[PDB]
Structure formats: C-alpha cells, structure tokens
Structure 1
Amino acid sequence: TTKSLLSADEKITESLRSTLSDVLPDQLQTYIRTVLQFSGRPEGANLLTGPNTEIEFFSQDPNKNFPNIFAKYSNVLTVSSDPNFITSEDEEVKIIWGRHGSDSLIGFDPGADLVGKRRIDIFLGDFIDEQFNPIPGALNAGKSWSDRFILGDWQKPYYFEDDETLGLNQSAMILDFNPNEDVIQLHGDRQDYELVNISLGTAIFWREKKGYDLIGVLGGVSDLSLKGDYFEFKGNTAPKTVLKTAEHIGTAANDYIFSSTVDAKGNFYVGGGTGGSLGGRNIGARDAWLAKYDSNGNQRWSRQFGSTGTESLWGMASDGSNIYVAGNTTGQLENNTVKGGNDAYLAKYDSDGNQVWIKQNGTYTLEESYKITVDSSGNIYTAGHTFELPSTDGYVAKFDSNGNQLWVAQFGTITLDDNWGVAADNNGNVFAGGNTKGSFGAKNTGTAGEYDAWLVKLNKDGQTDWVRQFGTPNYDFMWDIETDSLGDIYATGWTLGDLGGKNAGSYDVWLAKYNTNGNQLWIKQFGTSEDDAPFLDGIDIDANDNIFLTGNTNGNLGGANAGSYDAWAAKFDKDGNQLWLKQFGTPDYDTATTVTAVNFGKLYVSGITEGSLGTTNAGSYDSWALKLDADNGEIQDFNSSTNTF
C-alpha cells in the first residue's frame, strides 16, 4: 500500500500539473511560480509548465493587462466576513480569495451539470493585502481570521466524479489552511474519508466500497486527523426547517437574492443570481433572475435571463409600474453591442414580466455595478466602478425611460475607489457613496491605505456639488445609501474602528447622516463583541422617514444566535434613535441581503442561507423573504392577508 500511496502522489501531481498548466494564463502562472520559487517551494512551482511571460499593466489593450486576465480566473472578495456572493461555474480553474474577515468560501455548484468537466477551485482564505504590501506597521499586520472552506453539504460531497478513476478531474486546492483557526466543511461523516500524505501536503479522499475520489488538497499541511475540530461534517440529511413564515426560494444549485423593491400597487419584487433553473432554464453558470409577488404574498411570475457566462441582478428599482434592474455580466446580454467580458448592464421589465430593453456597456475596461435608483421624473441612475496606474474609479450614469444615456460622471483618487451606493433626491440631484484607499473628500488617516467612506452629491447635469469623506484609521466599509423625504443622505456600513462610538469588538455597524449641503449630522455605531455588519442592499427609508437596516452577525445582537452568522434587521428614526433590532435565522450560515419597506406598517427583509429557512433546503445556498411588522419587528406569515386564512 506504500506502492499505492506513491502512485496516488504521482497521479495527483500529474493531473493538477496538466489542468493548471492548460487553463491558467501564462502571466498568472509566471507570478505564482515566482512566489513559490522565492519561497523555495519547487513542488508547487513545477505544477505550472507554461513559459516565463512578462506581467503587463500598461497595455493599450485592457485584455493584455494582468488585472483583466486575473479577473477572468478569480473571485476576489471584500475586507468584510464574506460568503462567496460572486460564485459561478464559468471556468475550469478559479482562484477564490477571501481577503480579510471570516469568509465562508464556496466555489462548487452541486446543482450545475459538471459531468466530465475539469474543475479546480484554488482557495485563499486570507492572503490579506497587508501580506503583499511591503509597508511596515499596518494596523492589520499579522492578522488572520477563521475561514470556512466548503467542500460538501448535507446533500453530497463536492468535486465528486463517482467513477473508476481516483477522481482527479475535480478537486479543491486550499493554499492557506490553518488547522488552529480555519474549518473544512465536508458531506457525511469522518468514516467516509481518508487523509493521504502527498508531496503538496494532504489529500482528502472520499472513500466508499466502490473506490476513492479526490475532494481536496491542503497545500503545505501534514499529519492532520479527521477527528480534528477543524473538520466540520454535515451528515446526509437536510437541516430541520425553521421560520416556516418565510417565503422559500431554492433549487439544488446556489440561489441568491441580492435586491428587492416595491411598485405603486404594492407588488413586491426580489432578484439576484442562480446556478440553477429558478425563473427559467439555466443558460449557463450563474444567471440573473427576478420574481414578482402581489401585496398578499402570491408569486405572479419569475424571470431568468443571462448568457453562458456569469451575471447577477445586484439592484432593482421601480418608477411605480416598470422595474429597472442592474448588475454585471461576463457575457453579451445586449445583441446590438460588443461584450467586454466584465460589463455593467441595465434592463427594463414591465409589470407583466416582459424585458422591454436591455443596455450593456460593452468596453474592455473592467466594470462592476451594484446600485440603481429611480427619481420622481422616471429617470434612472446606476453606479459602479471601472478598473494611469491600475485602480478603480467611481461612476454614476443617468438614463431616460427608453434606456438612452443622458450622461456619465467618473471621479475618485489615484488609488482604489469603489461604489456602494446611489440615491436620488426629489430635486434633480443624485448621491453616490463608497469606499476609498485614498484622500478623496479628506486626508485618509489610514497609515497603510485602509478604507474610508466617501459621499458625492451630483446635480441634474452630473456635475459635482460636493465630496465628503469620513472614517477611522482602520478599515471602514460602506455597503448602501438612501435619501429621506427632506433629501438628506444616509449611509450604512461596518467599521473595525471607533467611528460613531467605541468599537464593541471586531466588525460593528454604523449609520451616518449628512444634510443636502454636505454637513455631517451624526454617526451611530452598534454591535456585539463579535462580527456585526450590514450587507449589500442594507438600507431603506419609507415614506415616513423611518430608516431600516439589515445584514448579518455571528453574535447575540438582537437575541440569541441560532448558529454561525444570522440575519438581523433594525429600525431607526431620522435622528438616529434605534426603535428596534431583531435577529433571525437557522443554525447554519444566514445573512440578510436586502430590505424593502412597503405601506400598512410592513417591511420585507430577504437574504440567503445554507440552512432550511421557510422550507427544507433544496441544496447548498437557498434564499428567503420575511415579512415583518414595521412597528416592532415581529415576523408575520409571508402569506398573511386580511381576506384569507
């Protein structure tokens, strides 16, 4: 069996070498080989057989530049504790990079058709910016977080070919697993696995009577045990259902709500991304989707659209009757226009679920867009960022109801500026907000380029009225903004510092208010000793100027934690007094992603879960929508109405 262990090392080495060298671009192979060579890790370097190729950043062809090449083969997540909210089965090899925070990393979609496909997901739990940045004395120097690498769920092991081979065509490769801190999540129980010592570290094999299948390789770690607390086993039964009052949305694939809205008749909409056939037949990898509910909880229609590439619905807004939707695509959604491979889109749906038009910005420059708003006059605003040194800059774009572009405003600093907010006032003006490593509206007090929050006010012509910036010396991260009926601008985010008050521990939530003239009115901060943050579409403001916030916590923020991260929602008045704070979820990972206030004192909070929220989990990530009473945060049945029982 010594001979069998030697044969496994050869077959794994030759299989990974073949796939990584065929798929990864030569610029990426060259960088990775240099890091491994410099660290004297030849076993890793010798997996990459492409020629040494110069790394380029200043080509006139964006497609020849390292960031654009890297973008195709990566999911680069945020400074937050992130679920992989950008996962999609669109490449054979993908780098999944958590960066700071306690990330819940998945790359595989167990509901996708991957029979016979090569799949390697390369996981970096941390590999925080400070590890690459040579400047000394950063606040977050040496910091690491507990990352969870998801290699199976209650339904099935991931990367499983279930055949007569060692199952080398599909595998995870985890590069920075720390058994003192991180977790590897597996299907089944410890009797279903064998650990094998290989040249690269540890091989995790699925083992049954019929044979062996490689599930993952743990780079640079040896002599682990399946009895370790760093392995979490999910068994083979769906989790018990909680919150049967929720609307449940799920397929066997990874399904996400990322946004919601309401129209002038009280119809409630949700939308996001899916790796499955949720609102229609899957077109390939992740698709965008949206669904309409009447004011009584009844689904009217669902729609799914996209490409063989990756797209999501990240924002939606209504003019009262139509539903405008925005997000990102790696495909070509508008047949009149070229595809850049990483492009913003805007589409218009009518109340009957017809796609009236779609507009795509087909340029080769990397573009992301997570935010949309509609004004009184029915004009549409989107916001996002575009990536002569390499860097993101913010933009706002204004359109008419026929999808004609009225103007585009681009702005920012010499360094990273990301957009996480757009909101119109009732007065022809539009606000944007986001994160910057630089000094955009103030000198950034961060000594190693830690993020601050920024806000811009633009007028009806896209000219800048003002820029503001606020922050601590540590990372502060904005997720979302909204206007009230007076035209004041509110932003929400997390901080690792003392922004509105003394940090309670780890990530805390903040809520900032500026007046229309750029004066900061107040910043509130709240949290537990644990990780608390709003997320994605995390603020809304009703007709009465009540502020609603939503996101996730792994503490006891609104009540006892059910397990992992839970969702939370809060109500504030326009002077920043907290009126209520509710927490809800499953024993498994949950987060809210969006909040929509409606009328008759009801509110919808929607999000994602790895558990059974509303009904039995259909596979991996599922989504949910909860109807709350706006007076006290009490959960109502989604289908509750005054005319039914």
Structure 2
Amino acid sequence: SLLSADEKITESLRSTLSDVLPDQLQTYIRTVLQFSGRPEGANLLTGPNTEIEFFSQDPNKNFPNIFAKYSNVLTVSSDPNFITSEDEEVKIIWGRHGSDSLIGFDPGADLVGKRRIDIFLGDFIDEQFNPIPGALNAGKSWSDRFILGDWQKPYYFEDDETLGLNQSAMILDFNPNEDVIQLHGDRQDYELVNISLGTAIFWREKKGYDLIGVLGGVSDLSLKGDYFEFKGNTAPKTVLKTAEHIGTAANDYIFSSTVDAKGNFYVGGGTGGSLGGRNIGARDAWLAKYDSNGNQRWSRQFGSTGTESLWGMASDGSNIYVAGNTTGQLENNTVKGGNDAYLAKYDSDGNQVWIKQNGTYTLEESYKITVDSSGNIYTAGHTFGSLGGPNQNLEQLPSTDGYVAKFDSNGNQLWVAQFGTITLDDNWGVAADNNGNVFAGGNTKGSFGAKNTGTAGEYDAWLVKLNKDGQTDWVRQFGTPNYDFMWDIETDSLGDIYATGWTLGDLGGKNAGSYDVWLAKYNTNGNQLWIKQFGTSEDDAPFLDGIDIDANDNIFLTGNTNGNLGGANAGSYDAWAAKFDKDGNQLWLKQFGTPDYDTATTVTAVNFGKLYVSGITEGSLGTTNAGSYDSWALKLDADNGEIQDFNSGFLNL
C-alpha cells in the first residue's frame, strides 16, 4: 500500500545514507546540495558536521580517498559510466558536463538482500560550484540518460512484500525538459507518487509495489512524458553478426587491445561477471587472446575482492603487459592506500607472470601503458599524492599531478617522474619513441606548458617529452578558451608525437557543433606541426584508447558520435573509426553500431594486416545482449574500413 509512502521513503533513505556515508562526505555533500538549486537530499544526511581532511596522510581519513570510495565522478565528455562497480552500498554517480549515459546498478550482480542507493547527478558541472562570471559554460546543461532499468529487468527491484525501499536510485538534478529516465517494461508497469522529496517511481508488481527511484525536486510528472524511455521486455535484435561478441549477464567492457608479433589479437577490460574466470568480487580485470583467424585461444581474469580494470595493454612482441587501477590488494602485493595503480605481465600462453601494485596513501588512477623496442615498459597516470616527487599542491585544495613510471621486463621500477601544476593535471596518454624517450599527454586546468586562455580553468591539452632517465625535455600545451580534452597519444616511426581528443571550441578549425574530434602532431623538438579538427553538428569524440599508428605511419582514430559522421546514425551514440596519413590527410571515415548506445574504446592496427576496432554496447552487436553492457571486436580492412567476418588456388609450376 502506498499509504504513508512519503514517510517510509524518507526514513529508509535517510537511515541508509546516514549509516553508510562517512560524516566527512556527508558534510561535503550537504554543502554541495545547499549551494545548488536542488537541496532536497541534504536532510537525508544526518551525520554531524565534520572537518573535511583534504590532506590527511591517513588513508582512512584522506578525503580524496573517502570521496572516491563512494563516488563515480565522470569526465567533461559525454560519458558512459565506464567506472561502475558493485563494491559499495551507496554511490554518488556524477556525470558533470556532456550528455552522460548514467548507470550504477549491475543487473547481473548478486545483490539479493543488499542495500543499494545510487545517487545520480546528471550535470552539476564545475562552473556551478566554482562560479566565475562570464565562464563559457556557466548555466549550460546536457541531456543525461538515467538508466533505472532496461529490456531485461527493472533495476533496484527487490520483488518482495515490502515497498522495496532497500534498493533505489535517487536522481537529484533531473530536468524533464532535457534529461531522460530509462525504464524496463512499459508505462502501465509504473505508478508515480508525489512526495515531499519530489517524485517516487514505483514498479507495479500487480500485487504490490517496489520503489525504483526518487526524483528530487520534481513533481507532477506524467509517465506519458517523452522524458521517460521504456525498453520493453525483449533483448534488442542482433546486428553486425560479423563482430566477435563478448558478454555475460553483468556489465562487461573492453577498454584496450593489442597485437603480438605473430598477429594474435588481444582485448581486455573490466567485468562484473565471470568472463575469463570466476568473479572474485565486484569488477575484475580480464583479457583474452585470438589467433589471426578469429579463434579465441584463451581468456583470463584477475584482481581482488575490490574493484579493478585493465585500462591499457601492450606487447613486447610475445608477452602482454597490462595496466590499470585497483581498490583492493592484488596477489603477492601490498596496498599503499586508497586506490592504487598496477602493472601486470602475461605470457603468450595466458600465464600471469607477475603483478606490481604501487601508489601512495591517496588516490592513483592509471589508464595508459606503452612498451619500447628494448622491451621496457612505461605506465602513466595521475596521483593526488607524492609518487615521483612532491605533489605540486601540498598541505598549506588537493588535485592531481601526472606521472610516468618506467619498468624493466621483470617489473623492477627504474624511475618514476611526476609533473604538473598546482591544479588538476590528468594523464591520458603515454608513448615511447625509438631513441629512448617517452611522451606523456593529458588534460590540465592550469598553465603547464603555456598560458591557459580559458577564463575559468577550462581544460587544455598538454604533452611532455621525457628522456631515458625520466627528466623532462619540454612541456607543451595547446587548446581553446573552452574545454579541450585529450584521450590518447602515439608516436610514428620518425619519433613525432600525435594526440587525439575532443574540443568544444575552434582548435584546428571552426567547430561544426557540440563536441568535435581533433588530431594534433608535434615533432620531437616540441614544434606544433598541425592540428586537424572534424565532426558533425552533433557530438563527436574519440574515447579511451583512441589512437594507434602502424608501421607505415598510418594513424587510426576511434570513438563515438551521435551524429551522421561516417554514415547514417543507427540510434543513440554509434562507434566510428578513421584513418589518416602522417601529414594529417584523412583517408577514410566509417561508422557502425546498433540502434542503442555504442562506443568504440580501442583501436589496434596489425602491421600489413587487419585493423581491429573494439568497444562496448547496450545493444545486441554480434549476438543477443546477455545483460546491460556487452563488448565487441570488429575486424576491418585497414585500406577502406570495411567490416570483415571476424572468423576466417595454388599452382605447381
């Protein structure tokens, strides 16, 4: 019975949120909500006001650690929630800028009897809480999609004789004029109820009710509004049966790929399921090997009871080096505090050779890896601590510096370099040349290699060249007064460095609309050679492992678009890929996907062989979707981007 729903919902949410969230974080979040135009959630956090320990060296009090533990804070890009993991009862999922596809509940995880509240902020952008008059993006917002169910099941659904208050979403900034709430089934499956907090969305069990989500600060909605998207009960019809499909009932992601000297193709990423092995807990890292004819040779899965992913992989020709982050303690390792980075080595037969976990007392992220021609390995990432040297911002607001770490083939650390500004510097790229140097790239809110022309700390792209000993040879910075965002970098055979990303401004040319793609080239002496910019009127961007360069110095880019970039858009975002020559001429541009959300995440070219583009989807790409996100790999003709079947006349003279 919906009688006294208002009181029961408030008491249940308040009880769970105030039990789970540390008082430090409750204090911080109350201040955020009060500063914004959506204060409804603040009364649900009843812990005492507590000093926020922004710079504590105790990993249990360090506030970046605490905030990261209970949050998925995404990027300025239009993001899928590429970091979601079932490792806490309560999560704050924060999209920031861009048209974000926000999910927090894994329908394939065993969550029976578990308290689960996901607090969603679709935008709540930096400009709102760092108010600077005239900031280019002040007052801007985007269409965010809040995923509260899909074709398979409603999310947060306990299906018992209670009101189902133990699991629920709580969306705090839903704007019915722009955002979308995605739901399982059809409108007859739901009843909306006006409550003090706003709106309660109940699933009708036809004998009872179950709370799916609360919408703070919005009332008098209609289930007939176009801001609700209903997904039915049947899996999407399959397209692109030429693709290799990888998926479980849980969220499965390919985030990276590589090839070895024999032409075997590797992919890897994170999974909430049992993909390469039995799930250890929450998200695990995984990888898999295919021969050049498309037959899978093996799959492996590793990690901890906490959360980890493979974010990057690279080969020395035979072995497969993999890098990422963990919230736990990996095998034969010790935790440094909070989240750490790791590097691991797999041999060609799938044997895990070693794992090296490292970091500081506070938050590390690591998304990138490269292997040089001598077989040494470099990882890159960012840290709130003092990993390669003192953080630029020590205790007097905490922020990241970039780092690069160099290892030998046995995992011995040869050096670690750390660099940046007093404010945010994130790494999104690492690449060795053939002469002992290594490049790194990423984003900064500051003036690292140049004066930032943004008036409100908007991101610029940066590049650093390090020598064989980890000393900087130069720092470069480029951008517009708006946000410019780098995703990946790579070198060519001459040692020149290329970077790819997106921009909201006019970086290489006039912006066609929304996000556009760019490709920039610098020479080894730090001279900017050119920047190409291209796109549609809609949202176009590379994503994650967005560039690769083959032995002919052809450049390949990949990412997502919700426009008609390479062809007619199939629906939502699609994947795209493109090929360039070393002088920036675009050789071809292709687009592919399903009617549902798709994005490429990685591209690897085989020298004189096939091109592989891989990624993730909410649709049925390759075969029927098994649950939430599945992943895919496409084998392309590198000369024209045409898709080949993934699985594949002699004269005696």
Offset, 1:43: 5.8
Note closer, same or farther for the CA distance 1:643–1:62 as it changes in structure 2 (3 Å cut). Answer: farther
Counterpart in 1 of 2:392?
A: none
SS at match of 2:310: coil
Offset, 1:211: 1.1
Note closer, same or farther for the CA distance 1:465–1:39 as it changes in structure 2 (3 Å cut). Answer: closer
> Are the aligned partners of 1:601 and 1:631 in contact in 2 as well (CA < 8 Å)?
no
CA shift digits 1:318-363 (9 cap, x unpaired): 0011000000000001434234230000000000101000000153
Offset, 1:40: 9.9
CA shift digits 1:172-197 (9 cap, x unpaired): 00000000000000000001100011
Higher mean alpha-carbon deviation, 380-389 vs 71-80, is at 380-389
Higher mean alpha-carbon deviation, 338-347 vs 170-179, is at 338-347
Counterpart in 1 of 2:605?
A: 597
**How many residues of Structure 1 are paired with residues of Structure 2 in the alignment?**
642
Counterpart in 1 of 2:391?
A: none
Offset, 1:73: 0.3
> Are the aligned partners of 1:73 and 1:95 in contact in 2 as well (CA < 8 Å)?
yes
Offset, 1:14: 1.0
SS at match of 2:215: strand
CA shift digits 1:520-547 (9 cap, x unpaired): 0000000000000000000000010000
CA shift digits 1:291-324 (9 cap, x unpaired): 0001110000000111111100000000011000
> Are the aligned partners of 1:109 and 1:254 in contact in 2 as well (CA < 8 Å)?
yes
Higher mean alpha-carbon deviation, 64-73 vs 167-176, is at 64-73
SS at match of 2:2: helix
Note closer, same or farther for the CA distance 1:362–1:505 as it changes in structure 2 (3 Å cut). Answer: closer
> Are the aligned partners of 1:156 and 1:187 in contact in 2 as well (CA < 8 Å)?
yes
CA shift digits 1:48-94 (9 cap, x unpaired): 22112112223232532322211100000000000000000000000
Note closer, same or farther for the CA distance 1:589–1:37 as it changes in structure 2 (3 Å cut). Answer: closer
Higher mean alpha-carbon deviation, 614-623 vs 4-13, is at 4-13
> Are the aligned partners of 1:334 and 1:359 in contact in 2 as well (CA < 8 Å)?
no
Rounded Cα–Cα distance in structure 1 between residues aligned with 2:304 and 2:490: 31
Rounded Cα–Cα distance in structure 1 between residues aligned with 2:523 and 2:35: 53
Rounded Cα–Cα distance in structure 2 between residues aligned with 1:41 and 1:483: 46
SS at match of 1:46: helix
Offset, 1:642: 12
SS at match of 1:587: coil
- Out of 634, 639, 642, the residue aligned to residue 647 of structure 2 is 639
Note closer, same or farther for the CA distance 1:39–1:262 as it changes in structure 2 (3 Å cut). Answer: closer
SS at match of 1:312: strand
CA shift digits 1:380-413 (9 cap, x unpaired): 0000000164110000000000000000000000
Rounded Cα–Cα distance in structure 1 between residues aligned with 2:29 and 2:151: 34
> Are the aligned partners of 2:328 and 2:335 in contact in 1 as well (CA < 8 Å)?
no
CA shift digits 1:210-267 (9 cap, x unpaired): 3111000000000001100000001000101000000000001000000000001110
SS at match of 1:545: coil
> Are the aligned partners of 1:245 and 1:635 in contact in 2 as well (CA < 8 Å)?
yes
> Are the aligned partners of 1:204 and 1:216 in contact in 2 as well (CA < 8 Å)?
yes
Note closer, same or farther for the CA distance 1:36–1:394 as it changes in structure 2 (3 Å cut). Answer: closer
Offset, 1:150: 0.2
Note closer, same or farther for the CA distance 1:185–1:293 as it changes in structure 2 (3 Å cut). Answer: same
> Are the aligned partners of 1:165 and 1:213 in contact in 2 as well (CA < 8 Å)?
yes
TM-score of the aligned structures, taking structure 1 as reference length: 0.97
> Are the aligned partners of 1:241 and 1:613 in contact in 2 as well (CA < 8 Å)?
yes
Rounded Cα–Cα distance in structure 1 between residues aligned with 2:650 and 2:533: 38
Rounded Cα–Cα distance in structure 2 between residues aligned with 1:643 and 1:443: 66
Identity across aligned pairs (percent)?
99
> Are the aligned partners of 1:248 and 1:615 in contact in 2 as well (CA < 8 Å)?
yes
Offset, 1:279: 0.4
Rounded Cα–Cα distance in structure 2 between residues aligned with 1:241 and 1:37: 46
> Are the aligned partners of 2:65 and 2:338 in contact in 1 as well (CA < 8 Å)?
no
SS at match of 2:155: coil
> Are the aligned partners of 1:23 and 1:93 in contact in 2 as well (CA < 8 Å)?
yes
Note closer, same or farther for the CA distance 1:571–1:39 as it changes in structure 2 (3 Å cut). Answer: closer
Note closer, same or farther for the CA distance 1:39–1:354 as it changes in structure 2 (3 Å cut). Answer: closer
- Structure 1 moving runs of 4+ over 6 Å: 38-42, 641-645
SS at match of 1:6: coil
TM-score of the aligned structures, taking structure 2 as reference length: 0.96
Rounded Cα–Cα distance in structure 1 between residues aligned with 2:9 and 2:485: 41
Offset, 1:417: 0.3
Offset, 1:7: 1.5
CA shift digits 1:117-162 (9 cap, x unpaired): 0000000000000000022110001000000000011000000001
SS at match of 2:3: helix
Is residue 500 of structure 2 the alignment partner of residue 479 of structure 1? no
SS at match of 1:131: helix
Note closer, same or farther for the CA distance 1:434–1:75 as it changes in structure 2 (3 Å cut). Answer: same
Note closer, same or farther for the CA distance 1:60–1:149 as it changes in structure 2 (3 Å cut). Answer: same
- Out of 150, 153, 157, the residue aligned to residue 150 of structure 2 is 153
> Are the aligned partners of 2:38 and 2:217 in contact in 1 as well (CA < 8 Å)?
no
Rounded Cα–Cα distance in structure 1 between residues aligned with 2:174 and 2:541: 25
SS at match of 2:490: strand
Note closer, same or farther for the CA distance 1:43–1:569 as it changes in structure 2 (3 Å cut). Answer: closer
SS at match of 1:313: strand
Note closer, same or farther for the CA distance 1:138–1:572 as it changes in structure 2 (3 Å cut). Answer: same
Higher mean alpha-carbon deviation, 123-132 vs 67-76, is at 67-76
Rounded Cα–Cα distance in structure 1 between residues aligned with 2:580 and 2:154: 43
Offset, 1:41: 7.7
SS at match of 1:12: helix
> Are the aligned partners of 2:59 and 2:337 in contact in 1 as well (CA < 8 Å)?
no
Higher mean alpha-carbon deviation, 579-588 vs 31-40, is at 31-40
> Are the aligned partners of 1:187 and 1:235 in contact in 2 as well (CA < 8 Å)?
yes
SS at match of 2:44: coil
> Are the aligned partners of 1:331 and 1:339 in contact in 2 as well (CA < 8 Å)?
no
Offset, 1:37: 5.5
- Out of 520, 544, 547, the residue aligned to residue 552 of structure 2 is 544
Offset, 1:491: 0.2
> Are the aligned partners of 1:63 and 1:364 in contact in 2 as well (CA < 8 Å)?
no
Note closer, same or farther for the CA distance 1:266–1:161 as it changes in structure 2 (3 Å cut). Answer: same
Higher mean alpha-carbon deviation, 28-37 vs 315-324, is at 28-37
Counterpart in 2 of 1:136?
A: 133
> Are the aligned partners of 1:337 and 1:362 in contact in 2 as well (CA < 8 Å)?
no
> Are the aligned partners of 2:55 and 2:63 in contact in 1 as well (CA < 8 Å)?
no
Note closer, same or farther for the CA distance 1:40–1:434 as it changes in structure 2 (3 Å cut). Answer: closer
Rounded Cα–Cα distance in structure 1 between residues aligned with 2:238 and 2:36: 48
CA shift digits 1:576-608 (9 cap, x unpaired): 000000000000000000000013441000000
Rounded Cα–Cα distance in structure 1 between residues aligned with 2:38 and 2:133: 25
Rounded Cα–Cα distance in structure 1 between residues aligned with 2:543 and 2:34: 39
The gaps in structure 1 that reach 5 residues or longer are none
Offset, 1:29: 1.2
Offset, 1:35: 4.6
Offset, 1:25: 0.6
Higher mean alpha-carbon deviation, 42-51 vs 460-469, is at 42-51
Note closer, same or farther for the CA distance 1:236–1:592 as it changes in structure 2 (3 Å cut). Answer: same
Note closer, same or farther for the CA distance 1:336–1:329 as it changes in structure 2 (3 Å cut). Answer: closer
Note closer, same or farther for the CA distance 1:436–1:36 as it changes in structure 2 (3 Å cut). Answer: closer
- Out of 579, 594, 618, the residue aligned to residue 571 of structure 1 is 579
User: What is the correspondence of 1:323-338 to structure 2 with a 5 Å cutoff?
Assistant: 323-338=320-335
Note closer, same or farther for the CA distance 1:36–1:348 as it changes in structure 2 (3 Å cut). Answer: closer
CA shift digits 1:13-53 (9 cap, x unpaired): 11101100100010111223345567798863332221121
> Are the aligned partners of 1:334 and 1:360 in contact in 2 as well (CA < 8 Å)?
no
Counterpart in 2 of 1:464?
A: 472
> Are the aligned partners of 2:62 and 2:362 in contact in 1 as well (CA < 8 Å)?
no
Higher mean alpha-carbon deviation, 386-395 vs 52-61, is at 52-61
Higher mean alpha-carbon deviation, 7-16 vs 399-408, is at 7-16
Rounded Cα–Cα distance in structure 2 between residues aligned with 1:599 and 1:66: 46
